[PDB]
Design a binder for this molecule. Structure first.
Ligand code: HEC
Ligand code: HEC
Lengths: 125, 125
């Protein structure tokens, strides 16, 4: 859907910005600094699950740029494993949020965060 | 969820970028230049319906900036009517996509586009 590689870069940066906001805005809740409203979190995590699927389609062939390392394309199977693992932890976070259980939310949140970092360590400049 | 007004600006710009991409990428399909795959479009419009709800919460009080005109805040009821009308046309586009009917999709797409422009005419610098 991108006329030029730069358009894919801008899309994925925007997608990731949104994803990151819907993840990070739960930090005070996980930490207990903000109240836990199970319905609120369930709805937010539903947004996050939609958003978490979007960046990866904007690293298509020929869309090198931004802070994406070239290894994303030359190691496509490994990059896909990092995106898959992240999306699988997002499924776990959805399950926690759907259950309405703060202890499970906290644990699932930390797993997601670790998956963000794991991908960055290998694939973000 | 924004530490500073600029963070709300960046969020809404990213949200709108995503929304705009999921809308605009259907232009070739509407025009008949790309094939019409009803399932493909139904799924894309589901993404668009999630995205289309997100920008407006990032124009909260005190988040003036970017290319948002100040009238968004001093005319809050009118701005809400433009966002509502847009989201109501998004519901119509979802119905069209769910029905699998290209003629209805085309018509609903044009209504959505007109609502984008209508808001810009009043509220985008
Ligand atoms: C690989 C499978 C990743 C996962 C999982 C996550 N991120 Fe990431 N992120 C990745 C890349 C390759 C890039 C650079 C994109 C580019 O082309 O520039 C990023 C970037 C970010 C950014 C900055 C976005 C911007 O506006 O430029 C942030 C804030 C960020 N990533 C956060 C983030 C979070 C919180 C994640 C898990 C919830 C996450 N990312 C996962 C690759 C990957
Ligand atoms: C008001 C209810 C709007 C509707 C409906 C749509 N847009 Fe808009 N848009 C609006 C504002 C106030 C702004 C400026 C935001 C800011 O703070 O800068 C915008 C901006 C855009 C942009 C540029 C985004 C960026 O990256 O800075 C685009 C490409 C854009 N808008 C497109 C767009 C489309 C295609 C819409 C309907 C599908 C649409 N917008 C609706 C306000 C409103």
């Amino acid at each position: 859907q991108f006329a030029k590689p730069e358009d894919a870069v801008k899309y994925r940066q925007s997608a990731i910005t949104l994803m990151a906001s819907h993840f990070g805005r739960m930090t005070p809740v996980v930490k207990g600094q903000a109240p836990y409203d199970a319905a609120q979190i369930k709805a937010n995590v539903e947004v996050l699950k939609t958003l978490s699927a979007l960046p990866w389609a904007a690293f298509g062939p020929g869309t090198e740029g931004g802070d994406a390392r070239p290894e994303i394309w030359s190691d496509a199977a490994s990059f896909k494993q990092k995106q898959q693992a992240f999306q699988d932890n997002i499924v776990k976070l959805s399950a926690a949020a759907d259950a309405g259980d703060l202890d499970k939310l906290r644990a699932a949140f930390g797993d997601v965060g670790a998956s963000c970092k794991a991908c960055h360590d290998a694939y973000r400049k």
